[PDB]
Amino acid sequence: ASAEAEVKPDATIEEIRAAARRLAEALRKAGVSGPVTVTAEAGDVSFSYTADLDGTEEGLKRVVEAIVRAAIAALKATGGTKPVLLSAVL
Secondary structure (H helix, E strand, O other): OEEEEEEOOOOOHHHHHHHHHHHHHHHHOOOOOEEEEEEEEEOOEEEEEEEEEOOOHHHHHHHHHHHHHHHHHHHHHOOOOOOEEEEEEO
């Protein structure tokens, strides 16, 4: 019930979404269902959201969009000069 990816500061939006889909896809690969709390950590800031991972494709895309939301907040808050640790906990 845990997944992490480290995103480079210079990352494109496609790269961020790729990381997000890897995290949600790893959570999908345990038969594991429930509220997922996602977090993006960068420097001295952290942002978290909760998305329901229910089993539907639509739940997966919700979780992905929460991850990408948190990630962009982190990169904006650190000026795109610091790596971002994406994590998703179930």
